[PDB]
Design a protein around this ligand. Sequence first.
Ligand SMILES: [Cl-]
Ligand SMILES: [Cl-]
Lengths: 284, 284
Amino acid sequence: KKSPVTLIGLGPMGQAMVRTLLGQGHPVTVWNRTPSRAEPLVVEGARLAASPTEAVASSDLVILSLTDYQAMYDILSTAESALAGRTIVNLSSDDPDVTREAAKWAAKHGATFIAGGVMIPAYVFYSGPKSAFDAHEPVLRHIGGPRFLGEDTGLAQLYYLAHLDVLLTTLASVVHATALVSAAGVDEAAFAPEAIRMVIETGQMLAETGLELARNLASGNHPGELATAVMMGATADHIVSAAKGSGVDLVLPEAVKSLYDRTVAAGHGKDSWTAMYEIIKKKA
Amino acid sequence: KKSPVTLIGLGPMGQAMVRTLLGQGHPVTVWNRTPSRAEPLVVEGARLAASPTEAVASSDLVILSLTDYQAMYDILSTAESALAGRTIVNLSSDDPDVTREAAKWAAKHGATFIAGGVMIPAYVFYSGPKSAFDAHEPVLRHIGGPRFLGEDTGLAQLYYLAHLDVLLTTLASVVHATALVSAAGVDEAAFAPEAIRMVIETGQMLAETGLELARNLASGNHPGELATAVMMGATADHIVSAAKGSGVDLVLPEAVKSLYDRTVAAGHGKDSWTAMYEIIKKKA
Ligand SMILES: [Cl-]
Ligand SMILES: [Cl-]
């Protein structure tokens, strides 16, 4: 009685989504480039499709969890005539303009398209036609906490990549800070927990520095308080010189130094450190 | 009956340290390039020194809280003959090799030298001769939680700058992620709190990903688990292409992409993301 679901892409994320959906009573048809990974899901109740075409034809809702959008094009190439009237929910990560081009390709073949972005703490960003999201939300809510962002298909991966922008850059800074200290002979195991704690401290500081951040970026006014761009720029300069003397790779701290240098050179030296937003943001 | 203290540099940090030390019964002699900032401390009980020489001569312990080490050289230039037999505790931020050169200059003028690094959540890194730290620890503990790091003078600013390496890079990523989303017309006030929450989530993830981080960096083995360098590198590539299409500044995500590119090109693609440490760390 529950609506059938097709899921293509049986990596770790797809495996968990199939198990979840089966436990909620949905018939799940699966397909994967290597059918061996489908075997555990078949014994849990899923049906292995004979081909991508038969997988697509088995449901009105086709969920894709692949490495990138090119994998969607390659897999569904032989199934394009079977896409008419169905909804594609692509949870794969890719460039936002790539996902927008996919919406045009989906419409060419008569399909509705929703882009998704999955965050494992789970919650999923969704973007595309709201009527399509509302039609499949009873199924999508079992995968994780749905957050509809808007009717621009590209939004889900834009938000996802911006979150990963924070994650990947922050993780890189922990590795870089550890190399900086360990260059002096300090045991990595001694300082790495401190660099980790600095992330937590940074988060809690951002839990009046956050009010400074959200207010300044939105209002466009960066009042120089306790932490100005010229003060932070001098610290960034010291980090670079320390890394240059330690023999530690420079590209990451030089990027931070580049942001503060251009922020000071633009006349925002006495303003808050948040004034680097005026250097980073989109022109005009 | 409490030991006298001299403190030079009456910015915000110096103001709080003087008030703290006075409240604990220590006579405090102060000096500043602009004597006006000493007036509030004088009414609290501090004595304004007539000159840097008289400030130095007033105590065996001289604490410096200036913008950089060059300010120490400039201020104490006329007081160099009065430094003999006293301990300089410099809490100013600067390059670690600059602080090591200061230890040589301090010994030239017969003074003991300790470098400090002040973290405002307060706790202070200290480095230099342990006998000097132990001799002044009863006074230093009132300033904040003392953490002796070792007898290399340069350690305190190395640890301090590595902590600030994490802080400044993480803060830059929050501003950059917000610009990435706001380039599409999203209100900054809508996404900036989400970018902030991503820092907190990153910290809590680092509170088995941390065991992965500390173990891999110290042992030098990066077993590829759920998050490999080739997977993270593809996400870094997407962030760059998204920023390149949004018109958002590229230097920060290109630095992260550069780290993953070289990590994959070095044969660590299947290893954990922590394998970028082998690209960042000091040669040999
Ligand atoms: Cl976009
Ligand atoms: Cl060093």
